Assembly symmetry: C2
Homo-oligomer: 404 residues x 2
Amino acid sequence: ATALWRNAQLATLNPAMDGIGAVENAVIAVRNGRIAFAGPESDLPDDLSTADETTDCGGRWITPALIDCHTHLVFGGNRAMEFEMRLNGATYEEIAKAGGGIVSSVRDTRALSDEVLVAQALPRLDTLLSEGVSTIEIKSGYGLDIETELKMLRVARRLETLRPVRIVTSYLAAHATPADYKGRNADYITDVVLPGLEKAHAEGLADAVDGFCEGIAFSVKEIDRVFAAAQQRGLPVKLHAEQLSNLGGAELAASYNALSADHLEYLDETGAKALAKAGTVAVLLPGAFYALREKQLPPVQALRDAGAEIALATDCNPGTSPLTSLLLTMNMGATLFRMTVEECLTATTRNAAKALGLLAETGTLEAGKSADFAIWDIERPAELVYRIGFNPLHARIFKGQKVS
Amino acid sequence: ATALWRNAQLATLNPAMDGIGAVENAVIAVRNGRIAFAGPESDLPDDLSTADETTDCGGRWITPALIDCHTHLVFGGNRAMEFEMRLNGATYEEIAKAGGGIVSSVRDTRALSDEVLVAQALPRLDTLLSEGVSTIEIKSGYGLDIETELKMLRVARRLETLRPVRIVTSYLAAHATPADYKGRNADYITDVVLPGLEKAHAEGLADAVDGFCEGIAFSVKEIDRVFAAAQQRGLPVKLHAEQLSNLGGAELAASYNALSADHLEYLDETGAKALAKAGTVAVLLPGAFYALREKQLPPVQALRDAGAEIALATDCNPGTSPLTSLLLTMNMGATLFRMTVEECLTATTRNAAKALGLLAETGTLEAGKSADFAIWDIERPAELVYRIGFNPLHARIFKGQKVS
Ligand SMILES: [Cl-]
Ligand SMILES: [Fe+3]
Ligand SMILES: [Fe+3]
Ligand SMILES: [Mg+2]
Ligand SMILES: [Mg+2]
């Protein structure tokens, strides 16, 4: 099965090229869901000069399909109630008494069946897919008990069977301490987090292990205990770090050659250099920054100077970032974090694939990788970062197949 | 013709009811594109108990159709180039040389035919309609010469013939001076603004007259000249005021019984009281605030205390607010301006209708008004303000007709 997509402008994001690796008057040759060639039509090899199908792209821009490397897409209910209460002047106490807080998401997720959870996640998933997203990372963390943490992962795996999308999962039991384990973080890790990890891995439901290293959650030493366990099983790790303060969560992840460190509002120069050295991707999440009215900006320039790679994600979750648009995420990255257009595009493609350890499989338009790309009805790549609340997607191709 | 919409929850936004005027187990009877009844299914008149068609809404929420009372939907090209340049550290001088700045939009709008401007606007219009918007205000202001200013208004009128939408226009020749009139605000008003207004009025192309009162634009005295001409031709007025400084534009608008005063970042207490006293709606535009990285927040509390009505709009334009989502606008009003959920829902329906002088015609679910409403797939109305980058629209009814 072969197919050609010619007469196009390519944003290959090939790291061997400058900028976004733009190629004019180009073509993409596909064979069995894989890219056989991506470059000038004049350089198209002879054995690939023909195919079963040929699509005239009319000179439109083609980029790698987008990747959302950080989301909590699976969960029950929503947190609109406390949103409204907060705006009405309610205190944290009044909200808590009304049932607000992360406990609301935990309760709502524990109460639903896999079937219902899939039903509630599909609308969120489809919104991302409609914007050219082909790969999405989904975390657990709203169960805080083995039974529910695992259910969340099964739901994620299930979603992948209902839509043309690539889904990778992260075990995040080390998200918060349940009421029944208050003041006993160690016991929670011993009784819930670790045995949960072994079970998830045995079930093949977890692609990575995540954690929340913060003053209000788990300490560096506590997360270290979780990473050690994951490392022994061959599972890559990642971490929510320096979101609300500088604890050293970033340096910890870097010491474990973590796939990424996420949020990083309070990351320092030392931590940035550590991430770059370890090759750990810095995942910035503008949605949470925006929704939480945060004032401390992540150290973009320090990350740039250290040579660290920056990725951007929606951090889609009901409590701090009920965001379902990766296009908007890039606009926020530029507007709020002052990232350049080149950085924003690379952040949701090449670096996003890297943050998920899938760069060899997808993320760029290079021969040998999966044929996952998005055709855009734009005149300039910048349009994807410039517009606010618009979708110029023309077509989405997943594994060589035009899906929508 | 007649029709019924039963088994639904209503957010009538009736000013006689508390909050957003919510009605449980309600129905909507429509006759000749008008609302015959809207309220409890039990209070339904036997006369309206029967209809040609009936629709079961499955208990879904229904609100008046949304209204975008402030946009510059019509224009040629886009400003993604300078967006990219600025992020790369380009100076204004460098951007100007690259052809950037408002001159880019004026040049493009003047160069494109009426037909092309219609086509370039359709995607923006459709994105708004996809969100349940049924009434949209479109301004001219990117022509800066009589022929182009009128062309923009004709384009706006023409759009109404291509889609199920109510479009109101605003003559905004007093937006800025073009290259040949810099330093000559008086002659510009004399040669273009006033004669253009006369011709626009003679052709029935303008529903209102707008202006930009600011240091970098026209003074109070200059705008007063334009408003006096508007008054003489029986046309209502509105004004872009206090966006970058406090010049007293709001106060002038109020003296002319302005339908609305928009932006208002620098509005003082005296100004807020003048608006409430005159009945002028305060139109806040979070898109421009966000995109321009503004630091001065409009006086929301002063507006609340003075009793002024607040509306929210996209201010969709290529230069300062390339925003095409009214749902996102509400989330920004809440997130950036700290407006309550009730204020945000009212800001895009009842108060928006008022800002356009259309309250007697639409904006609330009351008998005698146009049957324009949106059916949503939501649990609570707060969800429309809470989510970021999501569209829960189930169906759109325009003048009693299901269109989306
Ligand atoms: Cl074309
Ligand atoms: Fe997260
Ligand atoms: Fe405006
Ligand atoms: Mg095109
Ligand atoms: Mg008056």
